[PDB]
Structures are given as structure tokens and as C-alpha cells.
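[job 0412] stage=complex_fold ligand=zinc ion status=START
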Amino acid sequence: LLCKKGCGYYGNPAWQGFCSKCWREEYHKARQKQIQEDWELAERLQREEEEAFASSQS
Amino acid sequence: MQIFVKTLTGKTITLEVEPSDTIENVKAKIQDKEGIPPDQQRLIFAGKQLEDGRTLSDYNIQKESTLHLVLRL
Ligand SMILES: [Zn+2]
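[job 0412] stage=complex_fold status=DONE, emitting C-alpha cells
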């Protein structure tokens, strides 16, 4: 029925039960966690290229 | 549309792109702005390194998406 954040608006099946505004907040949250996670991965991968280069020239 | 490409060193590149653009195409675009050759570039989104022959839409990269760039050595 109604928005799962308890907004008082109706949620949309195409948005996991959320309303236009509450779904935009979830979307923004998810996209911040994705950027953090990708940053962490890009650190791993940069550490690894520098090492692979360093042992290559050692 | 715009997407952003973040480096680890304090720079965000804004690119003009289409969901249909190849990753190779996007790296050419980064060569244009930044003078970095395509073969020195690794791009990451949603936990994955992006492949040269696939397109932004293959990865559900939409308007305002942020990718990360790492340099290949
Ligand atoms: Zn709501």
C-alpha cells in the first residue's frame, strides 16, 4: 500500500515500495556506498600496480 | 549526458558521453582532456574494471554516474 519509509505517500512497486522522494533518497544512499566501495577498490588496484612496477624494476 | 571520472589524486574529469559509448571511446575522451593514453588507464564502476569492447549502458552507467580512474604502469 503506502510508502515503506512511512511517509504518508503511496509507494510505487517499481521502486521497492517507496515513493518518488523516498526512493530518490535510497538511490542517493546506494550511489554513495558504491562510490566509497569503488574508491576502496581503486586504492587496492593502485597499490598493486606500484608494487608490480617496483618488483619489475627491482 | 555527464559522467564523472575521479582519480586518487584530487581531480574529477567531467565527460560528455552517450549510454552507447564504448569504454575505449570513453578512454579516448580522457586522452583528449588529460593527455593520458588509453593503455595507461583502468576504469572502475560498481566494483568492476570496465572492458574496452563493452559500453556504458552495459554497466548501467547513467546520468551523473561516478567512475574511478587508476593508472596502469
Ligand atoms: Zn515515502
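The longest helix of chain B spans residues 23-34.
[job 0412] exit 0
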